[PDB]
Enzyme design. Structure first.
Site, PDB file in Angstrom:
ATOM      1  N   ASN A  40       0.835  -1.391   0.063  1.00 53.10           N
ATOM      2  CA  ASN A  40       0.007  -0.165   0.082  1.00 53.10           C
ATOM      3  C   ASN A  40       0.646   1.077   0.032  1.00 53.10           C
ATOM      4  O   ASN A  40       0.258   2.458   0.059  1.00 53.10           O
ATOM      5  CB  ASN A  40      -0.907   0.101   1.314  1.00 53.10           C
ATOM      6  CG  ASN A  40      -1.725  -1.279   1.243  1.00 53.10           C
ATOM      7  OD1 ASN A  40      -2.206  -1.588   2.394  1.00 53.10           O
ATOM      8  ND2 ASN A  40      -2.111  -1.776   0.079  1.00 53.10           N
ATOM      9  N   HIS A  65       2.758   2.337   2.449  1.00 48.47           N
ATOM     10  CA  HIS A  65       2.924   2.781   3.642  1.00 48.47           C
ATOM     11  C   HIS A  65       4.257   2.168   4.250  1.00 48.47           C
ATOM     12  O   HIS A  65       4.481   0.841   4.113  1.00 48.47           O
ATOM     13  CB  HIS A  65       1.579   2.284   4.604  1.00 48.47           C
ATOM     14  CG  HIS A  65       0.608   3.468   4.544  1.00 48.47           C
ATOM     15  ND1 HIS A  65       0.553   4.275   5.277  1.00 48.47           N
ATOM     16  CD2 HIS A  65      -0.390   3.351   3.666  1.00 48.47           C
ATOM     17  CE1 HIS A  65      -0.718   5.132   4.934  1.00 48.47           C
ATOM     18  NE2 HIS A  65      -1.331   4.379   3.692  1.00 48.47           N
ATOM     19  N   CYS A  82       5.052   7.354   9.626  1.00 49.07           N
ATOM     20  CA  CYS A  82       6.064   7.970   8.933  1.00 49.07           C
ATOM     21  C   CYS A  82       5.753   7.794   7.364  1.00 49.07           C
ATOM     22  O   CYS A  82       5.599   6.701   6.967  1.00 49.07           O
ATOM     23  CB  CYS A  82       7.525   7.646   9.100  1.00 49.07           C
ATOM     24  SG  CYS A  82       8.927   8.188   8.115  1.00 49.07           S
TER      25      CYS A  82
END
Ligand SMILES: CC1=C(c2ccccc2)C(=O)N(C(C)(C)c2cc(Cl)cc(Cl)c2)CO1
Ligand SMILES: CC1=C(c2ccccc2)C(=O)N(C(C)(C)c2cc(Cl)cc(Cl)c2)CO1
Lengths: 258, 257
Positions: free
Chosen positions: A180, A182, A217
């Site tokens: 994804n 991430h 983050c």
């Protein structure tokens, strides 16, 4: 791997790989965290959740909700060596409206001894607003039958300036991004540990790590890893470059090598 | 995994893991390079080499020599998806006195279709002096019996300033260090790719990478990744931040998705 007899937990064996180990020829805590996530993901897929997220239920998908980690707690008694077979049993438990809890037991597959334990708290967040929200009846209905319903348990202050130790300018690489895009939850563990002095890592083993997840983050973010001494015990803070937002806080407990 | 029927190659199956895949839910080139290393390491252990190095022979230990990668060449036709089973066959061949060559074939475990190929050249060196040693008869004698003796094959200019693209200040983390405490050969692959523009990575798949290894990055070194465009093709240079000592040079070929 496969579901256990009662279909309420999932077991998988892993052969520790050459590149998964550090100085002691034993699995790094990052490897262990990756294996924990893998057996968790495989559990989800075994009971029919889609690969598009972490056990996103039908209703969570319609409402734009995702599971995110609030907290991770890992204790390792013995890190398995390169070529050793570890068996990990995992299960998930409903925590009322707050979220879900996934637990793990690690065993030496040859001896049957418990070599570690882990617990993680996951909360529901709107993927768009990043705002947390309570688990509704509709969402709980879609997963509760996969959870043991009687308790089954495997089982932090803000670092003050000045930090005793730091590693600054830590940046995600493309390999740190999941499907994804991430940052993988395990990257944060690696970043926390970067600010422990090499002399400790060379002479100690990590026995306990507790991480609180405050904020993601992003791919283009830069992170500072801050550590202060409190067996040796440390307090940890990850924050965005430029005295930015706190992303994680944590503690570690280290034991002398034998 | 296990040695094949004739005992001269090694096969292992891998189930691609959730965290081993990128955007397309298919294995990253870093994952494939790691699996290549793992099946190579497992081959070494199956024919009796200890874990203290990469197939260090008795005589190499006496002379303080280790195997290091000089060159890696990987071609991927199809990256396997999360949950797919890939089978990797690997073997090692003597290259006269130059060093050893390890090759790999990747297959779709279910169809037997070849989804990738790799070849690597490894040379003997004292890690401290970086001084290369031609393979003596005594060292060759300690491994030649584990190698096919007839040929079996799976199958770069220096970037000029200014580079078209760069990623600076790249530093190894503790997870990038192997059991023998040097930067994993797969980290250099990741570093090379960091300076490819996102627009290429988002729209293309890596088909070919060739890396020449010039010298090791130490735990406390900082690296700059430089890329210039030459299907899209790039020239690559990894050099130490500051003094600009060459670490690696490489080329990549990318196909549209
Ligand atoms: C429905 C669900 C399950 C779940 C519960 C019971 C059985 C299988 C999955 C689950 O484990 N969840 C969490 C978020 C804890 C999870 C953790 C991990 Cl490390 C992987 C996945 Cl992919 C997901 C939450 O939502
Ligand atoms: C003796 C030897 C073998 C070797 C030769 C025949 C059979 C097994 C290993 C071998 O594979 N070597 C290299 C260095 C190519 C190698 C490559 C990899 Cl990715 C792993 C290891 Cl651990 C080592 C060198 O020396």
């Amino acid at each position: 791997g496969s579901l256990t007899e009662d279909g309420l937990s999932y077991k998988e064996k892993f052969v520790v790989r050459s590149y998964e180990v550090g100085s002691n020829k034993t699995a790094t805590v990052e490897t262990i965290a990756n294996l924990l996530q893998e057996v968790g993901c495989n559990h989800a897929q075994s009971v029919g959740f889609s690969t598009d997220g972490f056990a996103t239920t039908t209703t969570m998908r319609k409402l734009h909700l995702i599971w995110v980690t609030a907290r991770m707690h890992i204790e390792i008694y013995k890190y398995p060596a390169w070529g050793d077979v570890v068996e990990i049993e995992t299960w998930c438990q409903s925590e009322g409206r707050i979220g879900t809890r996934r637990d793990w037991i690690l065993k030496d597959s040859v001896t049957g001894e418990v070599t570690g334990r882990a617990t993680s708290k996951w909360v529901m967040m709107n993927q768009d607003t990043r705002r947390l929200q309570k688990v509704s009846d509709d969402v709980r209905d879609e997963y509760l039958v996969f959870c043991p319903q009687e308790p089954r348990l495997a089982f932090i202050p803000k670092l003050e300036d000045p930090a005793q130790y730091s590693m600054i300018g830590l940046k995600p690489r493309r390999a740190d991004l999941d499907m994804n895009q991430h940052v993988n939850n395990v990257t944060y563990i690696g970043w926390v540990l970067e600010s422990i002095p090499q002399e400790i890592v060379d002479t100690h083993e990590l026995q306990v790590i507790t991480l609180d997840y405050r904020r993601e983050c992003q791919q283009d973010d830069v992170v500072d890893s801050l550590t202060t001494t409190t067996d040796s015990q440390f307090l940890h803070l990850l924050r965005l470059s430029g005295d930015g937002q706190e992303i994680n806080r944590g503690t570690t407990l280290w034991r002398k090598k034998p």
